[PDB]
Amino acid sequence: GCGELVWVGEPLTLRTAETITGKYGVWMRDPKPTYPYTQETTWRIDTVGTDVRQVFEYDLISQFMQGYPSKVHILPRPLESTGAVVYSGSLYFQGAESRTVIRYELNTETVKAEKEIPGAGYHGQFPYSWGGYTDIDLAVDEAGLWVIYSTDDAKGAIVLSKLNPENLELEQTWETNIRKQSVANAFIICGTLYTVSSYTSADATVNFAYDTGTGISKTLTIPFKNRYKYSSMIDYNPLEKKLFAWDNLNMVTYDIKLS
Numbered sequence: 613g614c615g616e617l618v619w620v621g622e623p624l625t626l627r628t629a630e631t632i633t634g635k636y637g638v639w640m641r642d643p644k645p646t647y648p649y650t651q652e653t654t655w656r657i658d659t660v661g662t663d664v665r666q667v668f669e670y671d672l673i674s675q676f677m678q679g680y681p682s683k684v685h686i687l688p689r690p691l692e693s694t695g696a697v698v699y700s701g702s703l704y705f706q707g708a709e710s711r712t713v714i715r716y717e718l719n720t721e722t723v724k725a726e727k728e729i730p731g732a733g734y735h736g737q738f739p740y741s742w743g744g745y746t747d748i749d750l751a752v753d754e755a756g757l758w759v760i761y762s763t764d765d766a767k768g769a770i771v772l773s774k775l776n777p778e779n780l781e782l783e784q785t786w787e788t789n790i791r792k793q794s795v796a797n798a799f800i801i802c803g804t805l806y807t808v809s810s811y812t813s814a815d816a817t818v819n820f821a822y823d824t825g826t827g828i829s830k831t832l833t834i835p836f837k838n839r840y841k842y843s844s845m846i847d848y849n850p851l852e853k854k855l856f857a858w859d860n861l862n863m864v865t866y867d868i869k870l871s
């Protein structure tokens with residue numbers, strides 16, 4: 613069920629952080645769940661601070677919006693920003709003050725792989741427009757794991773590389789002409805990169821698209837609402853066919869429609 617994005621729905625709040633620690637963060641579900649996890653298993657990370665290690669894990673979506681965690685993982689090293697992703701039983705996150713992506717197997721609590729994203733800017737070089745060290749942004753779509761970033765050679769333009777989920781080797785790389793810092797966030801649907809215009813506006817838009825298949829760039833004007841006017845995280849879940857987002861203490865989801 614692939615196609616081009618033609619519509620985004622109203623934001624739906626599933627849960628709200630009670631502490632300033634959760635001002636921005638990342639929540640997630642596995643698009644390719646494996647034992648002992650299911651499609652309902654939800655992970656949460658409040659990413660405010662310099663010592664971000666705690667990952668809240670919820671077996672049931674019910675626990676996740678109305679209860680306590682079923683488990684809390686302590687990451688081996690501090691985590692950077694809100695770009696993390698869970699895929700096929702592993703948490704993929706960026707080590708604090710680095711351009712290193714770590715593959716953290718959740719069930720075994722083991723580090724299975726680490727790789728330096730070649731030439732990638734980090735720690736405030738090429739963040740999204742709101743800052744927050746969002747230089748490196750992992751993504752999952754119908755084809756698997758990606759990483760969104762930029763380099764000096766790209767002059768801050770969004771670069772996206774297809775990643776091997778086992779060893780984190782770059783399989784292929786595309787260079788866009790979209791300034792990453794000029795955009796609120798980005799995600800990938802069916803091999804097409806999309807960007808959001810603003811992180812504060814209730815009247816923002818999905819304003820750009822870049823297709824890896826054809827290399828064509830396009831301007832869009834699909835409405836997109838930041839209900840709480842501070843979206844720190846915007847990701848696409850290819851299983852639910854939905855956008856997951858974190859907006860000013862609030863854990864939200866958007867419905868979408870594809871051509």
Ligand SMILES: [Ca+2]
Pocket residue numbers: 749750797798799845846847848
């Ligand atoms: Ca994103």
Ligand code: NA
Pocket residue numbers: 694695696697749750751846847
């Ligand atoms: Na991400």
